[PDB]
């Protein structure tokens, strides 16, 4: 770069950069009025900047180089600007002397580039969530059309210019002196990488990428000045590839490509899953129309409540000067409000207004009525939208499987983990919820908070079983909790629970499997099973669950659900006072979990049937005076562990288990 910038002729860095500004040969050099070919807001902007980067790389290759231009990753959070450009004078021991950096500033027509960094770049994002720039660029990927992609792409692109330039004319903040600072090349390379991510994801989706179908009329036009004869640009490959139908297949054309397509440590399928999970729920947008105002300036937004004050909602930035073609975006431009909506807990359809204020770089307030009536729109979630074709979603973390086919390794692992849980003894404390002791109070008397006989019954058991299995996986079991199927006729008791005792190779010794019995804490006794002689070779459970599943509404379903739930409980409890019969103690056995797992399974099955039938499924129609209040044991914080048990405790929240709890099943088949 030292040699290239010292060069002055048609091979000069100065000329290759002055391409992007003055002097002007745009639209054609032979015109009484000349502008710049920095196509801002057009539909060929990515094409043009890709050509610029290719020309820059070809030009620099001729000065003893090997690879392409490294891309500065401003998406990933940082605390300081890159040290490759931070220095002004650095010491090279090859000559054993210091000399000035070629990145700190750039001398152009008797003046140098100037930098004025602002602290708002150096924000430290709170743990777990990305930064503002990251989410802005992220929301440009789900849109399956380059037509709508381009606007978010360019707005993210030009955010950095105001973010880092400052308020100096002799700087890259303004378009006039922005192609002369060296880091501009780096930034545009990174933006080209963002676009490459875009078409990679497009190919993953399967829709065509190398042939957009929105602006073919303009896309037919060759670009300038990248198409005039070599007398104006020394190289030839860009001039020959001027027509922009071919700057898509970069790897086939220009013989170069990136290596790390990952974005903040996200693989392509991983970020696809993440964006689908984000799209799952409903949200809100602010919508703008954009046109030049001849002065690049920031635009801030604030929502004013008619029944209250007005509050700011962040800001974005736009580019514009007096030496470019006027541009008009075809469609709306989106901005996010969801964070402030959550913060102010205002209803999704309340009365309010959104007001935009335009401020120049200096700080002067231009008239706040230069963009018409800014709109606000609402977008329903993927769950809310229906396609009547299955569900077609894949989750992560927990995957619950039918233990009848579970292999012995994880079986031994999980029984060992449960034994360790009994060892530490917190299992009794966590299971004390469902019955005795009195962890509950009512009518001025020690009682149990065992929710029973209401629409919130399946909710409470699903939450309880998931909390218990999370506490178990805290011991690092090989697999998550399994479910014992009973829809198929049972030949006998399941092997894992009826086998006398296990033999572990860790000690190469026998030991009794806990699944038989467990000592109830400080009671002087232990549990005991008692099978019933009519539990086998019957289709009664099958036909009963079918005639319970046939129903349509929810409240009716709840009652037959509870009936069949307590059915096999009483059947297997037997004469034993301390068994699966009496619910005061019946939750102390692992059979409780092995049963409630399929108890949840059938609810999920009914959910799938309702989804297929198109009737309302997530929303309920009973206990509406209660469905807002979360479950009593899980309302508190001391007893409940963390996370789901204290945030996603709303019965209204409970329905969206596949997303707000992240656990799928092995399959939704129901007895073949």
């Amino acid at each position: 770069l030292q040699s290239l910038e010292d060069d002055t002729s048609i091979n000069g860095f100065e000329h290759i950069a002055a391409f992007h500004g003055q002097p002007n040969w745009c639209p054609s050099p032979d015109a009484e009025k000349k502008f710049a070919c920095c196509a801002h807001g057009m539909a060929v902007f990515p094409h043009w900047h890709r050509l610029l980067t290719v020309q820059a790389e070809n030009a620099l290759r001729a000065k003893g180089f090997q690879d392409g231009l490294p891309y500065w990753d401003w998406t990933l959070p940082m605390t300081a600007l890159p040290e490759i450009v931070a220095g002004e004078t650095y010491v090279n021991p090859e000559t054993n002397l210091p000399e000035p950096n070629p990145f700190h500033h750039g001398l152009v027509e008797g003046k140098k580039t100037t930098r004025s960094v602002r602290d708002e770049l150096f924000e430290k994002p709170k743990f777990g969530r990305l930064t503002k720039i990251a989410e802005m660029v992220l929301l440009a990927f789900e849109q399956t059309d380059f037509c709508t992609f381009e606007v978010q792409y360019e707005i993210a692109h030009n955010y950095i210019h105001a973010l880092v330039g400052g308020n100096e004319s002799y700087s890259m903040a303004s378009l006039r002196y922005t192609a002369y600072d060296p880091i501009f090349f780096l930034h545009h390379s990174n933006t080209d990488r963002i676009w490459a991510i875009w078409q990679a994801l497009q190919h993953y989706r399967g829709l065509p990428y190398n042939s957009a179908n929105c602006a073919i009329a303009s896309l037919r036009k060759p670009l300038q000045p990248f198409a005039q004869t070599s007398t104006i640009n020394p190289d030839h490959i860009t001039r020959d590839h001027s027509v922009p139908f071919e700057v898509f297949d970069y790897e086939r054309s220009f013989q170069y490509h990136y290596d790390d397509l990952e974005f903040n440590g996200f693989s392509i399928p991983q970020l696809q899953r993440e964006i689908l999970h984000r799209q799952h729920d409903e949200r809100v947008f602010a919508g703008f129309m954009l046109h030049g105002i001849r002065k690049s300036a920031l635009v801030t937004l604030e929502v004013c409540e008619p029944s209250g004050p007005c509050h700011p909602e962040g800001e974005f930035y736009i580019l514009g000067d007096e030496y470019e073609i006027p541009w008009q975006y075809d469609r709306l431009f989106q901005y996010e409000i969801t964070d402030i909506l959550a913060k102010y807990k205002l209803e999704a359809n309340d009365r309010y207004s959104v007001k935009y204020s335009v401020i120049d770089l200096d700080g002067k307030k231009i008239s706040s009525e230069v963009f018409g009536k800014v709109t606000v729109v609402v977008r329903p979630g993927s769950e809310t939208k229906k396609g009547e074709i299955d569900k077609n979603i894949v989750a992560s973390s927990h995957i619950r499987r039918n233990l009848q086919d579970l292999s012995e390794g994880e079986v031994e692992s999980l029984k060992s983990a449960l034994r360790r849980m009994q060892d530490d003894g917190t299992f009794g404390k966590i299971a004390s919820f469902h019955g005795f002791p009195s962890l509950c109070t009512h009518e001025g008397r020690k009682v149990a908070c065992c929710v029973h006989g209401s629409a919130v019954f399946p909710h409470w058991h699903r939450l309880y079983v998931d909390q218990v299995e999370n506490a178990l996986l805290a011991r690092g079991s090989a697999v998550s909790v399994p479910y014992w199927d009973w829809t198929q006729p049972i030949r006998q008791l399941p092997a894992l629970i009826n086998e006398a005792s296990y033999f572990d190779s860790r000690s190469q010794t026998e030991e009794s499997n806990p699944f038989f019995q467990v000592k109830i804490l400080d009671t002087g006794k232990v549990t005991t099973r008692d099978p019933q002689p009519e539990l086998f070779n019957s289709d009664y459970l099958l036909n009963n669950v079918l005639l319970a599943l046939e129903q349509t509404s929810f409240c009716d379903f709840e009652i037959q659900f509870e009936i069949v739930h307590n059915a096999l409980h009483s059947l297997v409890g037997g004469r034993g006072l301390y068994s699966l019969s009496s619910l005061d103690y019946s939750a102390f056995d692992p059979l409780f979990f092995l049963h409630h797992a399929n108890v949840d399974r059938i609810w999920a099955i009914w959910q799938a049937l309702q989804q297929y039938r198109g009737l309302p499924d997530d929303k309920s129609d009973c206990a509406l005076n209660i469905m807002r209040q979360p479950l009593k044991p899980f309302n508190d914080k001391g007893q409940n562990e963390f996370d789901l048990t204290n945030r996603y405790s709303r019965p209204i929240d409970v329905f969206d288990y596949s997303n707000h709890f992240d656990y799928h099943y092995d399959t939704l088949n129901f007895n073949s």
Partner: protein, 48 residues
């Protein structure tokens, strides 16, 4: 006739629970029920 079977080994009299009933539902074979057309005839009435 209804009897109560308990885990203790005993019974309970049926009077503790309300006496149940029998319900029969026809099949869902129904296709059309609404009349093809009504009758548009005027009817006069006394003024009082």
């Amino acid at each position: 006739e209804i009897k109560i079977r308990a885990y203790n080994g005993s019974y309970l009299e049926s009077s503790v629970l309300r006496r149940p009933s029998l319900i029969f539902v026809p099949g869902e074979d129904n296709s059309q029920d609404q009349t093809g057309k009504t009758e548009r005839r005027l009817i006069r009435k006394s003024v009082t």
